[PDB]
Amino acid sequence: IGSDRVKRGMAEMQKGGVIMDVVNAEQARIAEEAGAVAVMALERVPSDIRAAGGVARMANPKIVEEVMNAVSIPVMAKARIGHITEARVLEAMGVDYIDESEVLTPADEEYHLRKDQFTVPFVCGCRNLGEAARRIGEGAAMLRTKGEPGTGNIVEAVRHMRQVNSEVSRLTVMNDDEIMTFAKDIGAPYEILKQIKDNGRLPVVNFAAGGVATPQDAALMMELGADGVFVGSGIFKSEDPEKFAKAIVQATTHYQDYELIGRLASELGTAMK
Amino acid sequence: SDRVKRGMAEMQKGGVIMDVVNAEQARIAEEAGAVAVMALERVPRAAGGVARMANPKIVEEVMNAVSIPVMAKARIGHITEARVLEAMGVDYIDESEVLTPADEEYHLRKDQFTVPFVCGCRNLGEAARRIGEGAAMLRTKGEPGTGNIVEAVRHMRQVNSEVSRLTVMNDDEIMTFAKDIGAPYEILKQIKDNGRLPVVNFAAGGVATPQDAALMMELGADGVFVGSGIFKSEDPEKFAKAIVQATTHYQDYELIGRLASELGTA
Amino acid sequence: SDRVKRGMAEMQKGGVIMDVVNAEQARIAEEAGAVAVMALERVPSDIRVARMANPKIVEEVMNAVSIPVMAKARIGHITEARVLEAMGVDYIDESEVLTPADEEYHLRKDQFTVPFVCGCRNLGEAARRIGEGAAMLRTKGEPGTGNIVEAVRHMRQVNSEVSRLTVMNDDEIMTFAKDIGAPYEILKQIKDNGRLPVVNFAAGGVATPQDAALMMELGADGVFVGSGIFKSEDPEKFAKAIVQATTHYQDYELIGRLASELGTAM
Amino acid sequence: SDRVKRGMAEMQKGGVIMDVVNAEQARIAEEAGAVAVMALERVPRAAGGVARMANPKIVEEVMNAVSIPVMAKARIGHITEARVLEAMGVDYIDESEVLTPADEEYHLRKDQFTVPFVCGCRNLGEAARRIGEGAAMLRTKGEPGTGNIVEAVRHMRQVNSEVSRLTVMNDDEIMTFAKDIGAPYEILKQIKDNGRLPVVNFAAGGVATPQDAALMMELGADGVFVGSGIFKSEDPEKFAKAIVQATTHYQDYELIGRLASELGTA
Amino acid sequence: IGSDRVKRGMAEMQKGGVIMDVVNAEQARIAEEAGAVAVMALERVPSDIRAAGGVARMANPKIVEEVMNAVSIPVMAKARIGHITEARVLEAMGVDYIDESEVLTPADEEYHLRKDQFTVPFVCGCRNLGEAARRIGEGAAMLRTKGEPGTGNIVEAVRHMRQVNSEVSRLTVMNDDEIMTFAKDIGAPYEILKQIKDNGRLPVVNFAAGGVATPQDAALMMELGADGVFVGSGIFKSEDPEKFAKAIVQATTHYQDYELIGRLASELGTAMK
Ligand SMILES: [Cl-]
Ligand SMILES: [Cl-]
Ligand SMILES: [Cl-]
Ligand SMILES: [Cl-]
Ligand SMILES: [Cl-]
Ligand SMILES: [Cl-]
Ligand SMILES: [Cl-]
Ligand SMILES: [Mg+2]
Ligand SMILES: [Mg+2]
Ligand SMILES: [Mg+2]
């Protein structure tokens, strides 16, 4: 169901961009006006999710369409891992992407969605080439570091991006007759690995996500080789989300303009661990 | 006589059974479209104490407020609790691990009763022993009172996987499969000749939203139990109708999406 | 070009392949009814460092018979297999019976034009060998022991997990594949094919007509035999006995008839 | 170009570098005789949270209040944080484990920068890897923010002991010394031909009293870092001058005794 | 750099050929006659060193001299690991290379020779990039797999060669700011590993050694990325050493001529474990 070309093709249009977890119209248009290339709709931002605890389910559909009605950029929404019904509901709503998101308390602790049997594209989280390849093999069209969401600490996301990238590059120059047992050893589908090698990188875009709290943070992920940046708590849990948003957008676009980043950097206190 | 008992269980297939605490709740359930109600004293309770059966005044009040079948819970292995409810004329007893067990080693001989029983399970071994004792209905154990669907998903997947694997198992391997999972070897041979369970297996344990109940039907259940999900929530009567409609129309994603418009539990 | 490699392998479905060490054993094999022969220097039994056979021994067996010839090569030994392929053998057996040359990596059999056969013991090893381009599988068994039990375990083990897979949920095959070490793509094909997309022969320990019949009863697509034939009294009758027993594995009166020789392997 | 960088580091030898939080502090430091200042947002902080680099307004304010070199900290491995400070024109960046690391496996490639770096260490292995990455300065890690000198004593003793032991090590034993301590084998051969470290190694971590700073100089340091010791204390400007004077006149025990007249930290 | 260029240059001159363990002039002539690019003087071939056991020291200098007189191809001799004066004596005899061979009883179990302070070039054993880098940093000009000498079993040489090449190739595409941690993790000199990346491969030739018993064996190591082949027990503990020799040489240089290797191989009777 669907096409890989179409799903992956669309996700690539956000390359270089910043995506913003938002909770209402106001946050949504703030996201759009500040330069976000897509929004992510949710009921409460990952910082409040770990605080509130409880069971984190998908958002009320009322919330999602109120955001879709606020913005001209693509709207993403989260669904619980394996929650077949939540994804189908979101997809019928016509969201541009669903995030099978480990930020939400799962519904299935052993099996993820068969995302190839959907038409809406899916973004899936990961921490290494084995997880990336299982999600890709399930039909994911976009990848992002799992990171450590809601902590404003970038280190975990740095670790994951570094690990996926390292394993991928190792595979791109790996002996053909060593790939099967490489795949065995990391728990990855042999043919996805064989694709990845021939493509010379991942066949989907791999964003950074979790603990981006400062412009330098975002520019750092791009320096580390991310295809783009998610950020939710870091922006709206700050003294001026409007300024923080435009700072993180410019910093991600000009991640090597070090004096623009320092200039931009003059704002105020932000999220903490 | 198992044909009678199981056959009355099947008349619930596809429906929603709701835990109810008094008569308002009882017919709020019935008005909203429930196929049955569970009479109980505290919805899943994790307050504390010892959970025994309801007072019979509470069961009787519930049977006297609706025409859809009424079930009630008894502690595991509590011979007189089950016999008392059976004399009251409930339609089903649930020998329910939601209540403090009275016997921690041996369940009731439900074949030596005339009222049909529903018992919980988590895998084919528990489902086969409860069937062998004479259960006429099965439900996942799940994780009641938590509003988290994940454990019921795990149990539905485990029961169904082992069932479906048994349906195509070599004849001469079923004995030592039965040894390995702890199951009556004849109940397993029955399950193979039937290609599914001889009883209906409902989901139960933390159904909180319309999409929850629908997910369970998508996953292969025959129906849905729901208790805390409804009344522990903002405007329950609306929650009731939505969960009933989602459980019947569980692939109508536009309908489920609309239905989802309210404010959940926790 | 995998359909053509796998299609030739099916030409032996139902037959008996025989380890022969020279022209006259190769002729005995063909006379008795072998569908193919395995050229090799020391039979699996009295093997117990083992490299490929001298090419001279191999071509002698090609020269003696008109049914296809296979020869073994050490696991992962690129130039042993390349030499064999360029001598024109019909199949190469990347065989664990020989001392492995690469303990971590097998050959990329898809990058060859001669079709390959590999051993396995479970759906995991099977899928990985198929993923590398094996065209035909055999149980690893316990070669040279005249004892069938390991081949029985391997056959039963492969067939159970295949069966489990033909009815396994779609959204579970990835976690299955991870848990058993299998290429996910191959398991989805096995499901769609309803069986393994290559033929799986029983190998290792077949010592009597009854053994060859048992393996076929158990689901195999054919039998490999080596030791139990020539390390017995009158190998020529032992061959004809086993060949007939394999094609008529449910003609039990014939097998008992046929079972009328003397001493055997181990 | 390492000669340039390290040579500007040496112009601090014998002095005191002070953590400062705004401009008053900054020139209180300079008035009292500091050789350099560390710009930071919270003096060692053990309050909590995530410690990132200072806001550039805070760094700029500090550089605009003194003429002695200004340093600032960046999280370990935070490529853009270091690049940002480098564009601001600080004199040194400290890749500082006092701040929450941004990379927990890999430190910055400091040779690919033009501003000199100071990095922490606890032994010759950490000192040799930081040097090999391009550090132009070393400081003990110690135990910052605790006012306890003991961990910096331990680290100075360990670095110096291993250095001095390396200076007289047999040529043909340095490789497997380098393996054992985790160090670049060329950096170790350099250290031997030089008879000491090629950079200056300052003490840092809980200098609270004049006798503390002097003890570090007695122990073989090239200088003293101090942050909490000064401003977290009764009348800091007096503490400042006393620690500057004790670090220069570190064997003048009558002078240190007089200087010690005030009231410490905790 | 400098006299390393010369040392390494001279070892490269045997790239593609076969070096042969010989023990007297007649064996040494067979080697040269059959096409060897070099010979290795020793007193027992690794098969007998294993069976006799005892203490295996350098060869008696007559045996070496007898061998250098008998041939015009370079002569190598073995010395115990870390035996300073065994190497110095061999150097003064004018051998062309010394093998600091772990096939001999190590005289030093903790510290190898400082090879950069000799003028004769050295070949060293290894099993992974850590050992390789440490031998290079000590001044080796040539590497070889440690294999499992005397066993006639190629599997160990295959593992060592596959590991080295895997770690090398992974290094050639490895991030600059990760080579420190990589070097630490494997026990390698950080600067040698930065070299290996720059040159895009090992800066010295790395031969296969230990267990070559048939032409197919030798050809396989060439197939695996070896720069050349050592062989000792495999020849002279076989039916016809002279025919085994030329067949090995031919098969090493034409290691993708499967028609030829097959032809060559049809003269057998070999060694085993
Ligand atoms: Cl996020
Ligand atoms: Cl009873
Ligand atoms: Cl219930
Ligand atoms: Cl066999
Ligand atoms: Cl860098
Ligand atoms: Cl400090
Ligand atoms: Cl050797
Ligand atoms: Mg900032
Ligand atoms: Mg809801
Ligand atoms: Mg004091």
Numbering used by the authors:
A (entry chain A), E (entry chain D): 5 to 277
B (entry chain E), D (entry chain E): 7 to 50, 54 to 275
C (entry chain B): 7 to 54, 59 to 276
Paper excerpt:
Here, we investigated the biochemical, structural, and dynamic properties of the enzyme complex responsible for vitamin B6 (pyridoxal 5-phosphate, PLP) biosynthesis in S. aureus, which comprises enzymes SaPdx1 and SaPdx2. Pdx2 has glutaminase activity, converting L-glutamine into L-glutamate and an ammonia molecule.
Interestingly, independent crystal structures were obtained from crystals with different space groups. However, all the structures revealed the same quaternary arrangement and structural features. The dodecamer forms a cylindrical quaternary structure with an opening diameter of approximately 52 Å and a lateral height of approximately 84 Å. Each monomer is folded as a slightly distorted eight-stranded TIM-barrel with the top of the barrel pointing toward the internal aperture of the cylindrical quaternary structure.
